Design a protein around this ligand. Structure first.
Ligand SMILES: Nc1ncnc2c1ncn2[C@@H]1O[C@H](COP(=O)(O)OP(=O)(O)OP(O)(O)=S)[C@@H](O)[C@H]1O
Ligand SMILES: Nc1ncnc2c1ncn2[C@@H]1O[C@H](COP(=O)(O)OP(=O)(O)OP(O)(O)=S)[C@@H](O)[C@H]1O
Ligand SMILES: Nc1ncnc2c1ncn2[C@@H]1O[C@H](COP(=O)(O)OP(=O)(O)OP(O)(O)=S)[C@@H](O)[C@H]1O
Ligand SMILES: Nc1ncnc2c1ncn2[C@@H]1O[C@H](COP(=O)(O)OP(=O)(O)OP(O)(O)=S)[C@@H](O)[C@H]1O
Ligand SMILES: Nc1ncnc2c1ncn2[C@@H]1O[C@H](COP(=O)(O)OP(=O)(O)OP(O)(O)=S)[C@@H](O)[C@H]1O
Lengths: 731, 379, 195
């Protein structure tokens, strides 16, 4: 007896360009009879788990149509965005849908098509459908000029939501009316699926040309290679950091390429039985070979094809990998099939798959630079197109300049969070405002940047206060030198490119305790704008043989990803013995890893290294060399003006202006004090004032005299002589 | 003879009197399940509204984002030390929102047969797509989605993480679906699973403040009858300030232990006493608190024979300065805050052996009220 | 993976003879290229037979499938050159100039060399001011043994295959490594110390 398949396969009409066919689904007559859908009746088609389209049945030749295949024209397939090879559920329609009065003929190329085309044939093209919905495209209609063609869209119909993806309407001729428009898309309140296109991808121009070259010729022009006697390619392996655009490229290729599309979403095929995973792969490839041209997509190919020499890769993994190898390049030819796989871990995919004939090209989807990012942001904010007020192309360029380390998913999140800041702003002025009526200004993108960190930085939990350059008294030379490294390379980038010189990548801050070293680290973490990473000295060390070096390599990797970036090595001398004979093997290997990762066989492009030390002569010469820690900056005890600034900042909420204390006399009194000692003087004075009474009014000179009597000077001439004789080398 | 969760009855107009009442809940006799609500969650107000926003807009107003040309945020992750109320939030979200509610209870989906754990996840996400809007819960995500790069994560963990990644963002579509997850170890969750598009938001749920603990205690004690005797604000405020480092599970344990202490006191008074009138007096709470330990402190073992200042002979200067450091900045917080001064946060006690050095540390430990961690030189 | 097959199968009477299909040397490379360029035979122009020996001499590490990829990418490069000179030149009428194979070699790295991810921006011997003795000695090891192989075979000597570069920090030790990576022609691996 005939068995009814549970899932049908979309395929294209071979017959014709246009006609009355534009809503007819040819099906195997066994299936039509078994479902009592006799030819001419109304039947519905839809992707599994989703509402359905409405079409007209017809019987197909028994000797050609397999049981699975349903044949549909581009017109209908556009409605639900059915890609060839999608799995359909077919059903009979219980009720005939009603008639609409309005037919909203849109345009895709946006012309006044009534002028470019004879509407007397457009009427026939619109009439022939019989059924009408929002979404149906009509394609490649030749203009009056003849040399050019136009495409048309039915944007909406209505009469003057469950079980149906698109509201079905029947073309009752005469009561239907045209409402022409240049619009290219259906009413978004219907929520039809929106086709993907290459114009939505930004920053991957060369990669997009590579994929198009490696898909079009192998599929739609195989005679070209045969003329030259070279075999066509069979694979592309997109790879790169997570979030860079790989699956988006696969979706765009599936939507745009006119080929049969089969998918393997990770271990979607892995099955409990002995030979079902291999059977699934063989079925997929035989289907691809039966319906040429075809594309087989494999996301997370590192999950259904591991290295096969890895310890965890047993026989199941070996058999699956062997099946892939033999199906791509084996004794039987695979035909016009291109396998496009995406993977975040290219070196976990078996080496045998990564060679010509299996995966010819490997296309890297890398982290976007400034211009790729401007492209991404332009394209998304164009996908907005009226609700913005972010315009003139300068605001988006400013955002691209400010959002360092972003990967492309973070940019979409930034647009979304800016929209949400707009919504909550609107609520902030009117608790019932029309959220559909707001606009997302640059203030909103800036306000969303503060809640979106780059996906690269998610692992780096650093809970820091907010320290400004205004908090650091004195240190003007240090501030200028740090600006020259942190902000000038990014503001004056074109000038550096012109002069051909890149800025130095390292500073070693060295000085006595309590003078601004780590405070500058916090200031950079607040004011720099560029991403901040920090390692707290011997934090990295581990009892195991190879882990302390892996910590260095991993922090530098995370900095490379988030470049431009700052890495703060606090008390670096813990990592850098002098290699004078010490037997501390782990420290020496940490030092060597740090050396070879700051300046080694692979260059370090956008990272700036800051290191602070109390004992700078204990650091290795190779580390202090130009190119690793370029310039050495001395941060010494504050002078009179720096002390005075510290006191004015710390004593602000003391009502010092009343009477008693005088900050200039104090600043002169505290000679030799580290900044921390000045801060302690203020703290202990406020504490003594609280002891004399729980007032909130004012401190008095008695309190400062008492506090001064207690604080001893921790910095001695020996320390300053040490640091000055280190500084004497620079000259 | 059948057994019912609620007695069935039939209405026959006129012959069955519709007697009114003011009790806002069903009769307590019946043990009917009682909806958990946001009013039972203490603190976390901003986090609660963040959950409300990220649950409401993706599920109940998507056309607002489709209007603005941005995708909806399909992911929330709750992280913070254990006992802070992460599963409570998931249960209230489940019971309050009108959506298809599905749950992956970590090891509940796991099977020893090759592809079945992955098939459980695919079925859960396809059901969520089928019935919309849908909320998928994953309590302890780190149990089924480990780092995938560390040593113990083999092929099975790789395939389960790949399934989660591809069902959240892959060649398939999402729909009006939001995934809510909770974890005590955010960094043990696979790094590629936290990128925007998957678990976009990381709503941290941390230890409660003094205000948060006051809120939790008032809401916990609101559940009881008029046998509290703890003045709604004052006594509860004292208990809230005296609880340092508590997380919320331990506070519930403290309330239950207070009930235990009051009723064991009742039994010790007489076996046939009329217990219900045995108000839990604040001293019962005190007797309970000495029998519970803060979540962040179970492992801090101390012998600590309850030293007090008067045990130290003299040393009045040291006592005054240690009052300055440990007590005053909390007992006069607003004063320091208004002067812009943070109190000194370090002291070195040095002197000959056998003076009051360690004894003063123990006195601070058992008089300051705040927690006290101890270290030794060569340990 | 011969050793993954059970030894009981690798016994005379079951698998009597094992044949090793190894990596081609220069002569095998040239034979492969001659036969793959023989199937083309008119769209080629590379036919000097000295051009193919030249290509074979520079295809270091190429395993046999990489040569097929090389010819294919040569076809593609000549195609795109034709499109660059004229918008609609008949793609079937173009010929594969030697420049096309040279421009394809810059893209195809051997399959054996595909696990080695090294960023390594370009550096040239002209960037390394000084160190002339070092440059001469590095050539004597990296290029002379490949340019003058027959002379070495005649004299019966193998060139030294090791050099220790030592000196104070800041001179061109690792810079020489990057220069070799950019300019040696032969394949480049690197181990970064305690890595
Ligand atoms: N113009 C764009 N270029 C690149 N990425 C974009 C762009 N616009 C949006 N995106 C985002 O890029 C992401 C594409 O996902 P992928 O990076 O391919 O996923 P993946 O984490 O790398 O791993 P898989 O296996 O491909 S899901 C999505 O989150 C998109 O929202
Ligand atoms: N202008 C200032 N200069 C120096 N220290 C300041 C200044 N203003 C405040 N401080 C205090 O200085 C303290 C120490 O900060 P840092 O100077 O970074 O210490 P440090 O320089 O790293 O000393 P080491 O090497 O860690 S012992 C901070 O806690 C601040 O409160
Ligand atoms: N306001 C509150 N905050 C936290 N916990 C509360 C609160 N009120 C009651 N509790 C109790 O504290 C516990 C909170 O749930 P838990 O699941 O224990 O928290 P959680 O440990 O973060 O979640 P897990 O680890 O996934 S079980 C429950 O036993 C609640 O009854
Ligand atoms: N005012 C006091 N001065 C000194 N000892 C005191 C005083 N009051 C009580 N003691 C007792 O004297 C002993 C001193 O013990 P500790 O406080 O440990 O002295 P200690 O200086 O810390 O000894 P160390 O840490 O081993 S050098 C204890 O038995 C105290 O109970
Ligand atoms: N002709 C040259 N000779 C030496 N160094 C040069 C020359 N031209 C430029 N440099 C610079 O010198 C730097 C030295 O780089 P490296 O080769 O890494 O030094 P090194 O010999 O490895 O010293 P160590 O042992 O690694 S600290 C290069 O990064 C260049 O910036």
């Amino acid at each position: 007896k005939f068995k009814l398949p549970a899932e049908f396969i979309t395929r294209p009409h071979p017959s014709k360009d246009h006609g009355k066919e534009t809503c007819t689904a040819y099906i195997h007559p066994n299936v039509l009879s078994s479902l009592e859908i006799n030819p001419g009746s109304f039947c519905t088609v839809g992707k599994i788990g989703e509402n359905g389209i409405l079409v007209i049945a017809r019987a197909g030749d028994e000797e050609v149509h397999p049981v699975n295949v349903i044949t549909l024209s581009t017109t209908i397939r556009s409605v639900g965005n059915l890609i060839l090879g999608d799995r359909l559920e077919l059903k009979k329609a219980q009720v005939q849908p009603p008639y609409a009065t309005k037919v909203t003929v849109g345009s895709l190329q946006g012309y006044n098509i009534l002028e470019c085309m004879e509407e007397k044939v457009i009427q026939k093209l619109l009439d022939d459908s019989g059924v009408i919905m929002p979404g149906m495209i009509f394609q490649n209609l030749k203009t009056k000029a003849g040399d050019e063609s136009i495409d048309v869209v039915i944007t909406d119909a209505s009469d003057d939501n469950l079980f149906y993806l698109s509201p079905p309407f029947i073309f009752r001729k005469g009561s239907t009316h045209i409402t022409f428009s240049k619009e290219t898309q259906a009413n978004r309140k219907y929520n039809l699926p929106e086709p993907l296109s290459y114009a939505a991808v930004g920053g991957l121009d060369k990669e997009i040309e590579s994929l198009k070259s490696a898909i079009e010729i192998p599929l739609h022009q195989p005679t070209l290679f045969s003329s030259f006697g070279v075999s066509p390619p069979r694979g592309i392996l997109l790879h790169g950091p997570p979030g860079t655009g790989k699956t988006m490229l696969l979706r765009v290729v599936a939507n745009t390429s006119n080929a049969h599309v089969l998918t393997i979403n990770g271990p979607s095929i892995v099955s409990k039985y002995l030979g079902e995973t291999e059977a699934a792969l063989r079925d997929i490839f035989n289907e691809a070979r039966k319906y040429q041209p075809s594309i087989i997509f494999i996301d997370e190919i590192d999950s259904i094809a591991p290295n096969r020499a890895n310890d965890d890769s047993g026989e199941v993994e070996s058999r699956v990998v062997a099946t892939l190898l033999t199906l791509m390049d084996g004794m039987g030819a695979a035909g016009k099939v291109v396998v496009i796989a995406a993977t975040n871990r290219p070196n976990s995919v078996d080496p045998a798959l990564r060679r010509p004939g299996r995966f010819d090209q490997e296309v890297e989807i890398g982290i976007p630079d400034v211009d790729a990012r401007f492209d991404i942001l332009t394209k998304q904010f164009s996908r907005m197109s009226s609700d913005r007020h972010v315009l003139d192309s300068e605001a988006i360029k400013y955002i691209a300049s400010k959002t360092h380390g972003y990967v492309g998913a973070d940019l979409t999140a930034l647009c979304r969070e800016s929209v949400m800041k707009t919504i909550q702003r609107g609520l902030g002025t009117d608790a019932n405002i029309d959220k559909f009526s707001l606009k997302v200004t640059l203030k909103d993108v800036e306000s969303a940047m503060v809640d979106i960190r780059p996906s690269a930085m998610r692992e780096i939990f650093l809970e820091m206060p907010k320290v400004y350059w205004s908090d650091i008294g004195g240190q003007e030379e240090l501030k200028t030198k740090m600006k020259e490294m942190i902000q000038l390379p990014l503001e004056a980038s074109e000038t550096f490119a012109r002069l051909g010189i890149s800025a130095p990548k390292g500073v070693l801050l060295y000085g006595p305790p309590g003078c601004s070293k780590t405070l500058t680290a916090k200031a950079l973490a607040t004011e720099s704008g560029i991403n901040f990473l920090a390692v707290k000295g011997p934090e990295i060390f581990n009892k195991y043989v190879g882990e302390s070096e892996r910590a260095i390599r991993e922090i530098f990797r995370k900095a490379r990803s988030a470049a431009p970036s700052i890495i703060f090595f606090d008390e670096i001398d813990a990592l850098s013995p002098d290699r004078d004979g010490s037997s501390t093997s782990a420290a020496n290997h940490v030092l060597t890893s740090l050396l070879n990762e700051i300046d080694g066989v692979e260059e370090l492009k956008g990272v700036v290294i800051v290191a602070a030390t109390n004992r700078p002569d204990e650091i290795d010469a190779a580390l202090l060399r130009p190119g690793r820690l370029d310039r050495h900056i001395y941060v010494g005890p504050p002078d009179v003006n720096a002390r005075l600034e510290i006191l004015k900042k710390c004593t602000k909420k003391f009502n010092t202006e009343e009477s008693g204390v005088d900050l200039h006399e104090l600043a002169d009194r505290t000679e030799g004090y580290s900044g921390a000692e000045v801060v302690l003087l203020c703290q202990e004075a406020g504490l003594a004032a609280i002891m004399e009474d729980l007032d909130v009014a004012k401190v008095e000179l008695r309190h400062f005299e008492k506090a001064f009597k207690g604080i001893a000077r921790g910095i001695t001439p020996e320390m300053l002589s040490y640091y000055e004789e280190f500084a004497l080398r620079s000259g």
